[PDB]
């Protein structure tokens, strides 16, 4: 799927600005909020609700209403330096602990 970028350098520097990312969405009908997505580092690919992080390059798709941009970012791309910068490690840990412990109660 292409390896995640874990350096301090963004994979897509043209999408480093909040403003730049916001334009990629256009009119956006999806359950998940475009400004929250842009804030969490994501820009739209024009492939349904598929987004990529400007920094790690990590892709996310098929957004349910209960799925948070930042939480998903941490879930699937925990090495992302943008994520670490914006949210910090104690946020990242709680959210991993949370999804792991969720992946117990159902079974």
Ligand X SMILES: C[C@@H]1CN(CC(=O)N2CC(C)(C)c3ccc(Cl)cc32)CC[NH2+]1
Q: How far is the CB of 106 from Zn ion (least distance, A)?
A: 27
Select the residue interacting with Zn ion from 38, 80, 92, 95 (CB under 5 A).
Answer: 80
Q: What token pair was written down for 74? A: 């941490």
Which DSSP state fits 32?
A: S
Q: Cα separation of 56 and 72, whole Å?
A: 13
Q: How far is the CB of 5 from ligand X (least distance, A)?
A: 13
Q: Cα separation of 95 and 52, whole Å?
A: 20
Near Zn ion in 4-23, by CB under 5 A? none
104 is annotated as contributing to ligand binding: no
Near ligand X in 36-95, by CB under 6 A? 50, 59-63, 67, 72, 76
Strand order in the sheet with 42-44: 42-44, 51-53, 59-60
Expressed in angstroms, the distance from the first to the final Cα of the chain is 29
Binding residues for ligand X, per CB under 6 A? Answer: 1, 50, 59-63, 67, 72, 76
Binding residues for Zn ion, per CB under 5 A? Answer: 53, 55-56, 77, 80, 82
């Amino acid at each position: 799927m292409n390896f995640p970028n874990s350096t301090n350098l963004p994979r897509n520097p043209s999408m480093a600005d909040y403003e730049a990312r916001i334009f990629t969405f256009g009119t956006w009908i999806y359950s998940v909020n475009k400004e929250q997505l842009a804030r969490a580092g994501f820009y739209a690919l024009g492939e349904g609700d598929k987004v990529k992080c400007f920094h790690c390059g990590g892709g996310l798709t098929d957004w349910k209403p209960s799925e948070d941009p930042w939480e998903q970012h941490a879930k699937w791309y925990p090495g992302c330096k943008y994520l670490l910068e914006q949210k910090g490690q104690e946020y990242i840990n709680n959210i991993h602990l949370t999804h792991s412990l969720e992946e117990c109660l159902v079974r």
